[PDB]
Amino acid sequence: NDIQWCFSQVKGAVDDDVAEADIISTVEFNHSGELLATGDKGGRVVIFQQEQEHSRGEYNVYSTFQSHEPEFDYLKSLEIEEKINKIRWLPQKNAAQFLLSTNDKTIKLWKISERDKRPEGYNLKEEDGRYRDPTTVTTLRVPVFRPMDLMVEASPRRIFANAHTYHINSISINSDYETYLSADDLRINLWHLEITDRSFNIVDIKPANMEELTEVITAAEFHPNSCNTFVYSSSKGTIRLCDMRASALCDRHSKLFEEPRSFFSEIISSISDVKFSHSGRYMMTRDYLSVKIWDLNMENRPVETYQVHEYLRSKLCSLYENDCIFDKFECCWNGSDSVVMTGSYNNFFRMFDRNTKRDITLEASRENNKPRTVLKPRKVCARKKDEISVDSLDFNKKILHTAWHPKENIIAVATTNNLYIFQDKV
Amino acid sequence: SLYPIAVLIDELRNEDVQLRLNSIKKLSTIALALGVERTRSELLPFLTDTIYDEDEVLLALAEQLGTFTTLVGGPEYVHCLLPPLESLATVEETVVRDKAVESLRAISHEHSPSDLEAHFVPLVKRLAGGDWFTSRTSACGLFSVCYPRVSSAVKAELRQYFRNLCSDDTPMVRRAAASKLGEFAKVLELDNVKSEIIPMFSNLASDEQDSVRLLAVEACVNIAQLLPQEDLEALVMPTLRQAAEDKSWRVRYMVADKFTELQKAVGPEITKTDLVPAFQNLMKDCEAEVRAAASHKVKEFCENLSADCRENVIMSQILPCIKELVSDANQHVKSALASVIMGLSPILGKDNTIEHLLPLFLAQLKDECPEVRLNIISNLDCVNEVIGIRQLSQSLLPAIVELAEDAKWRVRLAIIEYMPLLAGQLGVEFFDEKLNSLCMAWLVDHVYAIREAATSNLKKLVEKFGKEWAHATIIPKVLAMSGDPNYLHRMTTLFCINVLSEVCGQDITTKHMLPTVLRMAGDPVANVRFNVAKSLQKIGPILDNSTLQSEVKPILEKLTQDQDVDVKYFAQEALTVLSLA
Amino acid sequence: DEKVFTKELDQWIEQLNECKQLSESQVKSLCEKAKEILTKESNVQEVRCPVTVCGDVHGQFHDLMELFRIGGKSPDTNYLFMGDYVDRGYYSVETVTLLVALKVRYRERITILRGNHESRQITQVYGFYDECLRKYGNANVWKYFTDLFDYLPLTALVDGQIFCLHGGLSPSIDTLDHIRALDRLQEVPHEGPMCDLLWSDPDDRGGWGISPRGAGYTFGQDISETFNHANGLTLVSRAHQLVMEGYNWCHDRNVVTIFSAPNYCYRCGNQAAIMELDDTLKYSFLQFDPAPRRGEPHVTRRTPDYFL
Amino acid sequence: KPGGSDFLRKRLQKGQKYFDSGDYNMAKAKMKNKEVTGDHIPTPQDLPQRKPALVASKLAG
Ligand SMILES: [Fe+3]
Ligand SMILES: [Zn+2]
């Protein structure tokens, strides 16, 4: 019953100069899955729309805009990078589309709307800008709207800035359609989607003296259904679940998820990302080497654990030297929560089937750039035929960001600078 | 003639928001020029779905579209204004939707009953049944206006539509329904309220979303005011009781924040049986916000209790809870309680106040937080009526003295504001012996704001203690500062004279104040010298005409020859204002 | 007629006190008037006691209002601001415009000296250029002020006993006569006596040193003692260095630093202070904290209204 | 172990490219009462361009 993933599309330049501004930094599907937002280190956001004709239509460019631009914080003598950290779509409220785009410092609410009406008509001039004699104004006429070629316009509606001392690493919308949280390294702020001049600091784990700092917030997320529950992971590998009903300030956690001896244990233990299951009963956390799935009812241990790449446990020394050990990988649930996807090195992304416990490795490479071509499972060992040696792994090729279509078996896998879209073999 | 109008119409397409905003704000002028017929056929279609979507621009348009009934030809063609407002009711921005809903409500009254069933009611059905929850959210605010006038058959349809909104899958819609549930019940028949509003009210009050349940509390108040008092126990109280015991502190906050409104709705009998136990729990709530909200209601809640058991309930059930609040760790809970705690003195009476309230009163004055102490000192009027403030004088003075000497000048500023109020309550006898030194000490404070506040405080004190008291006590000490080595303190003498002369009259200003002002005209510091010119300009009207010519004019003229530009300028201004030159 | 302009000028001061920026035409007219006054002032401007000495404000207008609420309102209180009126603040335009307006109105009451941030190059780095462009849509306002900055006196002398300057002493300068010889009507150099006077800072180390700022020199207590004795100066009041307590004596009380921007950059949380010189030259320090902002703090641990 | 408190703190202070007078002077007070900043002095040229100068993303191509 394994899904025979087939190459569908690849976007971006083919083995180009790979400028730093061209590196993809986030992939986020829409709530309905029609739109697929992509962010890069250059502050540019590209939105792809699926062809409207279960659906397996190709994704085509829909909108493009400069979400963030480089800035200099003259109050701190710091250059604010324009890299897009997280993109989060808001629930569709009208014909327009809304999403939140955040760099390390500022969150922006962007409205993407289609306009197909052109106001035509003038009194003191022509459509070409040629003015006329004002004395010839005998009868007033009102402009009319003329149909025009469809155009997509992206504009910033609200800017949420000047709230985080440290770098924002997560944004998550609340299920109440009103608020969302933004979590930096040491503080979590609660925002209102229609208010920008003030925010509520629910969580603040900053020590009184920074000399005593021992852990930082790595990720945070609201519960998909409950409006009062959110979980934020720390660099120690512990997830704290906060019930906003207990008190206004969530400094006291309702639950603490953790487990009871390598040299780099302090690093690999850090949780890169935490994702709630669609049902909300389960929670998945990604550390450097493994994926752990936690049942919210059980805190002592995870129900399931999956090893993303065991062959790199022996190479942590090399990874530390080149700083690859600090890569913050991500994890994604499928629509039915039965399969979880996470990325790896050498353009490998792993699929873990929870029901059957099966495990496959797939590669996103241009060599298979033929639509409707089955992806051959990859095996890494260090060696039989067709197996890729561990030494051959290219640690510069990191699949950090991945996204799963909320309903269908369509996954958007983002390499360093190319976005790959794969579909199930119908 | 038409050219100015052509400018406005062309600005509608202008890329500059300011020009577009200005043109839209003048649509009334544009409509008049176009005429009644042209406005319906040309202007309104252009305003239906505007390409521009600026929040301020759309908000301005919504306001204008609500006042076009006459311009579109009166009520006969008022329905032509629906499409422009229907689009605005669907926009993402909340304020624009709210204004659009307000405009729709305003023009709804101008629809005849036939029009409502033909043009307005279908609009509500479209918005209510729309696939975009922005439209459905706006539809909630339109049921109340149209329901009374539509026919019975239409009324049945509207209730069904409102029921669907209360069950909408989107929390945004449900919040809107809960907010408008109270007003929609005020127009429904009492039979339908019991049978149809209550099931919706109960369902919303138990909604999974905390943001929706907390809105049900307000609906509980409105629904209670409609039902008979005997029907509350079965229709309202079961929902209200769980709200006070709700898991979410946000819901409990609303109960505490609207407790007095609930008390006036359920009636005295229910208040004793249900609210009083609930109020105690709120004052003991684990969340500081809930306790602070409950504290504000202590005075109002106790007053409205039935006289048959007001004193007994307060002494036996409310007072013990207040004792814990006085010791509450949270600063804000203590501050909120302090501002209303002394309001219970008239209720309990003199004998009970001394034995029970007074120990808590002393504890508040000893609180470390200045705000708690300031709140107590600001609300001594109620205690004064019941028991003479002289009993509290020995305990207030240490608190006043400590505040008057606080390191933070803003704290010192606050007590100065309350000083004239306290002086009247404590009387002249106590003020002169004890508080007089504090007022003088403020005039020579390092912070200018304190000196400025003290100068104003002197004026207020004289207004109530009379001119004679000021001459004997305040004036002689104020003039002593004229010899202070610091020029800032010397200028304070002129500032004090500026305000004191306003109330001391000629009988005192000329005899005592004026000689000091003229003498200071020779101060070596130029800053003092031109304040004399400004001082004389202000007290000149009070002084008699003979005095001005004899003394003020020669001194002002001499200042006009001063080597400093500022002294010359203000000296010249004084003569011009005083008509001395 | 000068009275008509004075009444117009007074209206500007009241408008600025409300944090309302003047129009570009008004700013252009204001700067021209200021140049006529500043060009007549010496490099070492003589100041007559009593006077209140204030440090850096850095466009923190709401704190400047706090300063007046404590020191008093001009022209009642004589003030001496030691530069750095712009940059690193949300209201640089209003701050500098108000100070210039007061100088034009009350030239004899308020003295404004040049700070290291009163320069074209640095203003383009720390937001003043952006703020003028953002609040006007054009660089004319920025151009006008920057031209005016060139006429600001470098230093001030209070009764010939207290020497007030933004920065510190210079290796090339040994007596006040050398300072008067400088041509200050130019952009702030990156080297030389004019740069040092605005960039130099005191330090515990002895003699001269390398300034971490990348400009100016770091001078020890040895230089300060020599400079005071040579010129017969009782004290050397200065600014340009953040001090947590608002004022900080150093070099055996030969040099005092005054910083008048509380909670510098809205994050340092420091105290601000202003040194008040009595009629007899006695110095008194008044520390103060940032004024309460309306609808602040931006990030609050108290539940906001929308969530309540 | 290669982690620790200082390991986290250094990651918080990403870049530290430019010297800041505020941070430098705050540190001095703490030290006297009991890296701090970069060495480069910011220059207008070093700052981002006054206006955007970035082309459309190659993904949109
Ligand atoms: Fe400086
Ligand atoms: Zn400075």
Tab-separated table of C-alpha atoms in Angstrom, chain B residues 123-463:
chain	number	residue	atom	x	y	z
B	123	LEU	CA	-30.327	41.199	1.444
B	124	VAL	CA	-30.150	39.800	4.979
B	125	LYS	CA	-30.813	36.311	3.620
B	126	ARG	CA	-28.019	36.699	1.062
B	127	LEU	CA	-25.540	37.886	3.693
B	128	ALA	CA	-26.723	35.304	6.228
B	129	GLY	CA	-26.491	32.511	3.654
B	130	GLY	CA	-23.314	33.806	2.041
B	131	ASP	CA	-20.340	31.493	1.645
B	132	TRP	CA	-17.941	34.125	3.051
B	133	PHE	CA	-18.162	34.442	6.822
B	134	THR	CA	-17.480	38.179	6.563
B	135	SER	CA	-20.941	38.501	5.020
B	136	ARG	CA	-22.478	36.160	7.595
B	137	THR	CA	-20.799	38.115	10.393
B	138	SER	CA	-22.406	41.333	9.148
B	139	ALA	CA	-25.807	39.670	8.712
B	140	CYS	CA	-26.066	39.185	12.481
B	141	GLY	CA	-26.487	42.931	12.995
B	142	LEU	CA	-29.381	43.314	10.542
B	143	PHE	CA	-32.001	40.953	12.004
B	144	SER	CA	-33.095	43.282	14.808
B	145	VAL	CA	-33.970	46.283	12.633
B	146	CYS	CA	-36.102	44.406	10.093
B	147	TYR	CA	-37.784	41.852	12.370
B	148	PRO	CA	-40.378	44.144	14.039
B	149	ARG	CA	-41.919	45.462	10.814
B	150	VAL	CA	-41.870	42.375	8.578
B	151	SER	CA	-44.901	40.106	8.429
B	152	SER	CA	-45.354	37.069	10.659
B	153	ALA	CA	-44.378	34.657	7.882
B	154	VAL	CA	-41.153	36.589	7.285
B	155	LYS	CA	-40.478	36.711	11.032
B	156	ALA	CA	-40.478	32.908	11.125
B	157	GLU	CA	-37.897	32.810	8.330
B	158	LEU	CA	-35.672	35.372	10.059
B	159	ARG	CA	-35.597	33.388	13.303
B	160	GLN	CA	-34.543	30.273	11.389
B	161	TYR	CA	-31.771	32.224	9.656
B	162	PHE	CA	-30.536	33.594	12.983
B	163	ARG	CA	-30.574	30.079	14.438
B	164	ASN	CA	-28.316	28.897	11.612
B	165	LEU	CA	-25.851	31.711	12.318
B	166	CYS	CA	-25.623	30.724	15.988
B	167	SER	CA	-24.611	27.232	14.802
B	168	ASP	CA	-22.132	28.435	12.172
B	169	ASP	CA	-18.863	26.527	11.905
B	170	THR	CA	-16.818	29.743	12.058
B	171	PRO	CA	-16.115	31.238	15.515
B	172	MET	CA	-16.196	34.715	13.966
B	173	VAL	CA	-19.848	34.245	12.991
B	174	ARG	CA	-20.800	32.729	16.347
B	175	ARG	CA	-19.196	35.633	18.208
B	176	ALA	CA	-21.218	38.052	16.081
B	177	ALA	CA	-24.418	36.108	16.760
B	178	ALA	CA	-23.714	36.051	20.499
B	179	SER	CA	-23.037	39.796	20.530
B	180	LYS	CA	-26.299	40.546	18.698
B	181	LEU	CA	-28.319	37.846	20.481
B	182	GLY	CA	-29.307	40.232	23.265
B	183	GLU	CA	-30.746	42.909	20.992
B	184	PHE	CA	-32.484	40.366	18.754
B	185	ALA	CA	-34.315	39.029	21.813
B	186	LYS	CA	-35.570	42.504	22.753
B	187	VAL	CA	-37.707	42.585	19.587
B	188	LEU	CA	-38.879	38.954	19.584
B	189	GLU	CA	-42.153	37.882	21.145
B	190	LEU	CA	-41.810	36.636	24.710
B	191	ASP	CA	-43.108	33.209	23.672
B	192	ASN	CA	-40.380	32.870	21.037
B	193	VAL	CA	-37.705	34.117	23.449
B	194	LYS	CA	-38.370	31.248	25.852
B	195	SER	CA	-38.665	28.649	23.087
B	196	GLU	CA	-36.071	29.832	20.543
B	197	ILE	CA	-33.668	32.346	22.104
B	198	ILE	CA	-32.939	30.219	25.181
B	199	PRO	CA	-31.820	27.118	23.212
B	200	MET	CA	-29.467	29.364	21.238
B	201	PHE	CA	-28.356	31.194	24.384
B	202	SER	CA	-27.675	27.891	26.143
B	203	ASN	CA	-25.753	26.501	23.164
B	204	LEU	CA	-23.577	29.601	22.788
B	205	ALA	CA	-22.865	29.700	26.526
B	206	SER	CA	-21.450	26.154	26.253
B	207	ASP	CA	-19.467	26.787	23.063
B	208	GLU	CA	-15.983	25.308	22.846
B	209	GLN	CA	-14.516	28.722	21.994
B	210	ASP	CA	-13.707	30.787	25.076
B	211	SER	CA	-14.115	33.928	22.969
B	212	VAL	CA	-17.731	32.917	22.274
B	213	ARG	CA	-18.757	31.829	25.778
B	214	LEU	CA	-17.579	35.106	27.306
B	215	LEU	CA	-19.972	36.941	24.973
B	216	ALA	CA	-22.889	34.867	26.281
B	217	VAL	CA	-22.603	36.642	29.643
B	218	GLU	CA	-23.749	39.931	28.114
B	219	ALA	CA	-26.573	38.097	26.346
B	220	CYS	CA	-27.469	36.620	29.737
B	221	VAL	CA	-28.018	40.120	31.141
B	222	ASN	CA	-30.298	41.178	28.286
B	223	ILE	CA	-32.273	37.922	28.274
B	224	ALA	CA	-32.787	38.147	32.039
B	225	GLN	CA	-34.291	41.634	31.762
B	226	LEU	CA	-36.931	40.260	29.365
B	227	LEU	CA	-38.079	37.045	31.033
B	228	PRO	CA	-40.406	37.050	34.055
B	229	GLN	CA	-38.568	36.901	37.361
B	230	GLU	CA	-40.086	33.481	38.087
B	231	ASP	CA	-38.760	31.968	34.835
B	232	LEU	CA	-35.104	32.868	35.464
B	233	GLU	CA	-34.453	29.840	37.682
B	234	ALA	CA	-35.175	27.501	34.754
B	235	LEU	CA	-34.077	29.544	31.716
B	236	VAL	CA	-31.228	31.832	32.845
B	237	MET	CA	-29.654	30.740	36.129
B	238	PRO	CA	-28.480	27.286	34.925
B	239	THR	CA	-26.462	29.047	32.221
B	240	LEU	CA	-25.343	31.880	34.504
B	241	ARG	CA	-24.164	29.537	37.265
B	242	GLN	CA	-21.853	27.611	34.936
B	243	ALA	CA	-20.472	30.872	33.537
B	244	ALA	CA	-19.312	31.932	37.004
B	245	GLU	CA	-17.765	28.455	37.369
B	246	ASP	CA	-16.386	28.391	33.819
B	247	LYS	CA	-12.949	26.877	33.301
B	248	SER	CA	-11.773	29.849	31.241
B	249	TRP	CA	-10.778	32.855	33.326
B	250	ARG	CA	-11.913	35.069	30.440
B	251	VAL	CA	-15.520	33.970	30.945
B	252	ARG	CA	-15.254	34.449	34.710
B	253	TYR	CA	-13.860	37.935	34.092
B	254	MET	CA	-17.014	38.910	32.197
B	255	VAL	CA	-19.218	37.637	35.028
B	256	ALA	CA	-17.230	39.716	37.512
B	257	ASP	CA	-17.155	42.723	35.177
B	258	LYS	CA	-20.950	42.595	34.681
B	259	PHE	CA	-21.941	41.350	38.135
B	260	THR	CA	-23.844	44.521	39.038
B	261	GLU	CA	-25.816	44.356	35.788
B	262	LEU	CA	-26.656	40.726	36.554
B	263	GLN	CA	-27.732	41.730	40.064
B	264	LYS	CA	-30.200	44.308	38.735
B	265	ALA	CA	-31.590	41.699	36.304
B	266	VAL	CA	-32.019	38.571	38.434
B	267	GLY	CA	-33.536	40.504	41.340
B	268	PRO	CA	-32.835	40.546	45.079
B	269	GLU	CA	-34.138	37.026	45.732
B	270	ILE	CA	-31.815	35.364	43.221
B	271	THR	CA	-28.940	37.634	44.269
B	272	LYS	CA	-28.964	36.308	47.835
B	273	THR	CA	-29.284	32.653	46.829
B	274	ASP	CA	-26.983	32.528	43.785
B	275	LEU	CA	-24.983	35.697	43.116
B	276	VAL	CA	-23.649	36.145	46.660
B	277	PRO	CA	-21.950	32.706	46.712
B	278	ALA	CA	-20.756	33.398	43.165
B	279	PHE	CA	-19.332	36.789	44.142
B	280	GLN	CA	-17.305	35.197	46.941
B	281	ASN	CA	-15.794	32.705	44.495
B	282	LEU	CA	-14.853	35.494	42.081
B	283	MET	CA	-13.076	37.416	44.847
B	284	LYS	CA	-11.144	34.189	45.552
B	285	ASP	CA	-10.437	33.487	41.878
B	286	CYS	CA	-7.007	32.142	40.978
B	287	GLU	CA	-6.581	34.811	38.278
B	288	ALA	CA	-5.598	38.293	39.430
B	289	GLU	CA	-7.612	39.914	36.636
B	290	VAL	CA	-10.823	38.270	37.858
B	291	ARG	CA	-10.169	39.311	41.460
B	292	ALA	CA	-9.424	42.887	40.398
B	293	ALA	CA	-12.650	43.052	38.383
B	294	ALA	CA	-14.641	41.660	41.312
B	295	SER	CA	-13.034	44.187	43.663
B	296	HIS	CA	-14.380	47.120	41.640
B	297	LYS	CA	-17.917	45.784	42.160
B	298	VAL	CA	-17.739	45.488	45.962
B	299	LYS	CA	-19.267	48.913	46.595
B	300	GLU	CA	-21.911	48.762	43.858
B	301	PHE	CA	-22.864	45.153	44.599
B	302	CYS	CA	-23.323	45.709	48.337
B	303	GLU	CA	-25.478	48.819	47.890
B	304	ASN	CA	-28.012	47.056	45.661
B	305	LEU	CA	-28.550	44.211	48.140
B	306	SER	CA	-31.988	44.160	49.736
B	307	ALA	CA	-32.157	46.138	52.969
B	308	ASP	CA	-33.613	43.168	54.860
B	309	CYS	CA	-30.214	41.430	54.825
B	310	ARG	CA	-27.767	44.002	53.422
B	311	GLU	CA	-25.810	44.505	56.646
B	312	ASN	CA	-25.876	40.853	57.722
B	313	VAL	CA	-24.711	39.513	54.353
B	314	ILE	CA	-21.888	42.051	54.041
B	315	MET	CA	-20.598	41.433	57.563
B	316	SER	CA	-20.830	37.634	57.369
B	317	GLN	CA	-20.077	36.840	53.708
B	318	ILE	CA	-18.562	39.830	51.887
B	319	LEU	CA	-16.361	41.276	54.637
B	320	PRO	CA	-14.309	38.077	55.205
B	321	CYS	CA	-13.456	37.943	51.498
B	322	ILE	CA	-12.347	41.588	51.518
B	323	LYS	CA	-9.862	40.833	54.299
B	324	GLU	CA	-8.034	38.398	52.019
B	325	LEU	CA	-8.046	40.922	49.167
B	326	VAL	CA	-6.386	43.575	51.339
B	327	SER	CA	-3.482	41.126	51.699
B	328	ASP	CA	-3.581	40.125	48.022
B	329	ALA	CA	-0.123	39.842	46.490
B	330	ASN	CA	-1.210	41.406	43.196
B	331	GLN	CA	-0.823	45.182	43.235
B	332	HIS	CA	-3.786	45.832	40.939
B	333	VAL	CA	-6.263	43.849	43.047
B	334	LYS	CA	-5.387	45.943	46.100
B	335	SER	CA	-5.576	49.173	44.096
B	336	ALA	CA	-9.006	48.283	42.707
B	337	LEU	CA	-10.333	47.363	46.152
B	338	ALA	CA	-8.900	50.489	47.780
B	339	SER	CA	-10.871	52.796	45.482
B	340	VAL	CA	-14.222	51.301	46.564
B	341	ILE	CA	-13.585	49.636	49.927
B	342	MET	CA	-14.398	52.751	51.959
B	343	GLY	CA	-17.727	53.062	50.137
B	344	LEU	CA	-19.137	50.398	52.468
B	345	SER	CA	-18.989	52.678	55.524
B	346	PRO	CA	-22.491	54.184	55.057
B	347	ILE	CA	-23.979	50.715	54.574
B	348	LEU	CA	-22.497	49.143	57.707
B	349	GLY	CA	-22.927	52.226	59.904
B	350	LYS	CA	-20.661	53.911	62.417
B	351	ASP	CA	-20.404	51.067	64.932
B	352	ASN	CA	-19.703	48.383	62.326
B	353	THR	CA	-17.381	50.622	60.304
B	354	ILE	CA	-15.030	51.262	63.228
B	355	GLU	CA	-14.834	47.625	64.326
B	356	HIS	CA	-14.547	46.013	60.880
B	357	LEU	CA	-13.779	48.441	58.044
B	358	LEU	CA	-11.352	50.663	59.956
B	359	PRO	CA	-8.714	47.942	60.578
B	360	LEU	CA	-8.686	47.263	56.833
B	361	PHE	CA	-8.515	51.002	56.145
B	362	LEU	CA	-5.355	51.327	58.242
B	363	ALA	CA	-3.776	48.323	56.517
B	364	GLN	CA	-4.340	49.888	53.093
B	365	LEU	CA	-2.657	53.142	54.139
B	366	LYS	CA	0.404	51.121	55.188
B	367	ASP	CA	0.573	49.338	51.826
B	368	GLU	CA	3.858	49.722	49.972
B	369	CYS	CA	2.201	50.568	46.651
B	370	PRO	CA	1.612	54.342	46.352
B	371	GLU	CA	-1.446	53.741	44.165
B	372	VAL	CA	-3.222	51.808	46.925
B	373	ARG	CA	-2.523	54.608	49.402
B	374	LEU	CA	-3.548	57.273	46.885
B	375	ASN	CA	-6.832	55.491	46.159
B	376	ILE	CA	-7.707	55.341	49.864
B	377	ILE	CA	-6.872	59.005	50.424
B	378	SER	CA	-8.905	60.043	47.373
B	379	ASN	CA	-12.108	58.411	48.662
B	380	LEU	CA	-12.404	59.641	52.256
B	381	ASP	CA	-15.617	61.601	51.620
B	382	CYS	CA	-17.869	58.594	52.238
B	383	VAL	CA	-16.121	57.771	55.521
B	384	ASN	CA	-16.229	61.417	56.603
B	385	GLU	CA	-20.031	61.485	56.436
B	386	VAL	CA	-20.380	58.329	58.540
B	387	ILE	CA	-17.540	58.941	61.015
B	388	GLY	CA	-15.650	62.168	61.610
B	389	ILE	CA	-12.410	62.252	59.640
B	390	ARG	CA	-10.703	63.558	62.784
B	391	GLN	CA	-10.736	59.937	63.949
B	392	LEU	CA	-8.653	59.054	60.871
B	393	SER	CA	-6.453	62.159	61.117
B	394	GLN	CA	-3.770	60.507	63.251
B	395	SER	CA	-3.593	57.656	60.708
B	396	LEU	CA	-3.902	59.704	57.508
B	397	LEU	CA	-1.132	62.174	58.342
B	398	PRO	CA	1.698	59.581	58.307
B	399	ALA	CA	0.416	58.353	54.940
B	400	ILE	CA	0.121	61.875	53.517
B	401	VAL	CA	3.564	62.865	54.803
B	402	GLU	CA	5.194	59.770	53.310
B	403	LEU	CA	3.549	60.355	49.927
B	404	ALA	CA	4.460	64.053	49.974
B	405	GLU	CA	8.132	63.052	50.370
B	406	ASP	CA	8.224	60.120	47.942
B	407	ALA	CA	11.363	59.807	45.837
B	408	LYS	CA	9.380	59.574	42.591
B	409	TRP	CA	8.058	63.036	41.770
B	410	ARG	CA	5.038	61.635	39.922
B	411	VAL	CA	3.891	60.073	43.195
B	412	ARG	CA	4.421	63.446	44.866
B	413	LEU	CA	2.406	65.000	42.038
B	414	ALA	CA	-0.568	62.717	42.700
B	415	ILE	CA	-0.859	63.639	46.382
B	416	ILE	CA	-0.677	67.344	45.497
B	417	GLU	CA	-3.740	66.902	43.286
B	418	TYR	CA	-5.699	65.442	46.213
B	419	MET	CA	-4.294	67.964	48.705
B	420	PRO	CA	-7.053	70.599	48.274
B	421	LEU	CA	-9.701	67.889	48.654
B	422	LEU	CA	-8.106	66.610	51.865
B	423	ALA	CA	-7.604	70.121	53.237
B	424	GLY	CA	-11.332	70.833	53.118
B	425	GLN	CA	-12.238	67.501	54.703
B	426	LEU	CA	-9.630	67.891	57.457
B	427	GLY	CA	-10.474	71.571	57.980
B	428	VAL	CA	-8.328	74.650	58.431
B	429	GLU	CA	-7.394	73.763	62.013
B	430	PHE	CA	-5.685	70.503	61.056
B	431	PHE	CA	-4.196	71.811	57.805
B	432	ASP	CA	-2.397	74.739	59.437
B	433	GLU	CA	-0.846	72.657	62.217
B	434	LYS	CA	0.227	69.635	60.150
B	435	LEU	CA	-0.240	69.927	56.378
B	436	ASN	CA	0.882	73.552	55.970
B	437	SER	CA	4.565	72.596	56.103
B	438	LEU	CA	4.126	70.023	53.331
B	439	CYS	CA	2.584	72.566	50.956
B	440	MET	CA	5.420	75.048	51.487
B	441	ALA	CA	8.026	72.308	51.056
B	442	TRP	CA	6.611	71.546	47.603
B	443	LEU	CA	7.121	75.120	46.381
B	444	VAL	CA	10.897	74.664	46.753
B	445	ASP	CA	10.949	71.193	45.217
B	446	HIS	CA	13.706	70.409	42.737
B	447	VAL	CA	11.258	69.156	40.103
B	448	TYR	CA	9.558	72.042	38.318
B	449	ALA	CA	6.353	70.055	37.799
B	450	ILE	CA	6.033	69.730	41.577
B	451	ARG	CA	6.555	73.470	42.040
B	452	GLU	CA	4.030	74.155	39.277
B	453	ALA	CA	1.502	71.797	40.866
B	454	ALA	CA	2.080	73.321	44.304
B	455	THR	CA	1.529	76.809	42.886
B	456	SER	CA	-1.846	75.733	41.501
B	457	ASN	CA	-2.627	73.966	44.781
B	458	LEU	CA	-2.292	77.275	46.633
B	459	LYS	CA	-5.017	78.842	44.490
B	460	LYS	CA	-7.441	76.014	45.263
B	461	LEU	CA	-6.691	76.154	48.994
B	462	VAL	CA	-7.386	79.895	49.110
B	463	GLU	CA	-10.674	79.404	47.248
